């Protein structure tokens, strides 16, 4: 049933969970007790921009991801329409969250316009760039700047253009 907390996410059975833990050795990330763990996730989605076109359909993405990450057991923070500076501030705040200490992993989701150099903030234009670099996301969440997530999976997902090219070439058959 999809009426449960995991919604449409197919469940791993105990026999399945024991088999994964058996077949492969001690090279799986440990999972914390469901009862006590405090899993956290952050979605930053820029939909309305100052200069660049409106990201129509962003609502479907936010809804889908939010529900999915909740289904997987994460408490989801959703922040919308931020400058690169605001995103950095929000990321710094996320890294300082006490729940990470009693969490086993995290998800970070960025959804916005993007260029080759990185993700576009709300105030972005070609004349006055407003860009968050992927490099900065890793730095803010690494062991130095986020000690609480040491040894824990940090999954970053980015929906954005990485340039202007269609990404295709022709060949004959």
């Amino acid at each position: 049933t999809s009426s449960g907390s995991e919604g449409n996410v197919k469940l791993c059975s105990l026999e399945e969970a024991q088999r994964i833990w058996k077949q492969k050795s001690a090279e799986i990330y440990p999972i914390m007790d469901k009862s006590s763990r405090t899993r956290l996730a952050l979605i930053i989605c820029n939909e309305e921009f100052d200069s660049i076109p409106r990201r129509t359909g962003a609502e479907v993405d936010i809804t889908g991801m939010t529900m999915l990450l909740q289904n997987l057991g994460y408490s989801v923070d959703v922040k919308k329409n931020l400058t690169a500076s605001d995103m950095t501030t929000e990321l710094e705040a996320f890294a300082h969250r006490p729940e990470h200490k009693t969490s086993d992993s995290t998800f970070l989701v960025f959804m916005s316009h993007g260029i080759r150099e990185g993700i576009c903030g709300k105030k972005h234009s070609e004349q006055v760039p407003d860009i968050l670099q992927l490099n900065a996301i890793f730095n803010m969440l690494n062991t130095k700047n986020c000690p609480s997530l040491k040894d824990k999976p940090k999954v970053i997902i980015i929906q954005a253009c990485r340039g202007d090219s269609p990404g295709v070439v022709w060949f004959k058959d």
């Binding site: 996410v9 059975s13 969970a17 993405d61 999915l68 997987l72 993007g114 062991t143 090219s165």
Partner: protein, 88 residues
């Protein structure tokens, strides 16, 4: 006492396209990469680790149409398999 730890470890990034290239979004259906990821997470989180799931997502994009993209895994420092164990 103090101990050394790697500054950067246990990361995986998943981007919607390859460098230099566009990622597509439908006005009512949403972003194709996001929808495809949700679908694959929902189906495969029970049996596959995230690296495996991400590969399957890439595979689903293999046949290009008028709006083509190839999602890309980046800066991977996962030292173990990350299973979500949904339901647990």
């Amino acid at each position: 006492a103090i101990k050394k730890a790697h500054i950067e470890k246990d990361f995986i990034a998943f981007c919607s396209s390859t460098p230099d290239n566009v990622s597509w979004r439908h006005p009512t259906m949403g972003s194709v990469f996001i929808g495809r990821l949700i679908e694959h997470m929902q189906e495969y989180a029970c049996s596959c680790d995230v690296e495996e799931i991400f590969r399957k997502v890439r595979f689903s994009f293999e046949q290009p149409d008028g709006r083509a993209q190839m999602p890309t895994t980046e800066r991977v420092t996962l030292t173990r398999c990350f299973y979500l164990f949904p339901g647990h």
